[PDB]
Structure formats: C-alpha cells, structure tokens
Amino acid sequence: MAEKTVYRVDGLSCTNCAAKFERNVKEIEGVTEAIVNFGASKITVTGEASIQQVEQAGAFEHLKIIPEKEA
C-alpha cells in the first residue's frame, strides 16, 4: 500500500542517540523515510519496513518500542 507506521519508544533521552537511531534506520534498505522523535515520544518508519529492524538497531541502548496501535 504505502507502509508508513509510527511506534512509541521509551527509556532513553539523548539527541546523539536520536541522531544515531534515525541514521541506523536510514542505513536499512527496506525503509524509505523515518522520523524519530526521541526524548519522550515516538519513531515513524515509512517505506516497506517494520520496527523489528529498528528495534534490533536499538540494541545499542536496549530500547523497547511498542506499536502505538490505534484501536
């Protein structure tokens, strides 16, 4: 279809880690865009990927990212 999704992330609070994270996502080939609102919010992925890969990437700090599944 056009797989944009946004998931909540929690634990961390560092811009450098935000930067490293969005970059980590961008360096995955399955995604097209991603917008990481780290601090106390959420991570948008857009392309044809799922948090699983981003989550794996986040093993650097062991983030937990929960799908903000509406309904």
UniProtKB/Swiss-Prot annotation:
Function comment: Couples the hydrolysis of ATP with the export of cadmium.
Task: List where in the cell it is found.
Answer: Cell membrane
What is known about its induction?
By cadmium.
Q: Which residues bind Cd(2+)?
A: 14, 17
Q: Which family does it belong to?
A: Belongs to the cation transport ATPase (P-type) (TC 3.A.3) family. Type IB subfamily.
Looking at the record, the residues that make up the HMA domain are 3-66
Source organism: Listeria monocytogenes
At the top level, the lineage of the source is Bacteria
Full protein name: Probable cadmium-transporting ATPase
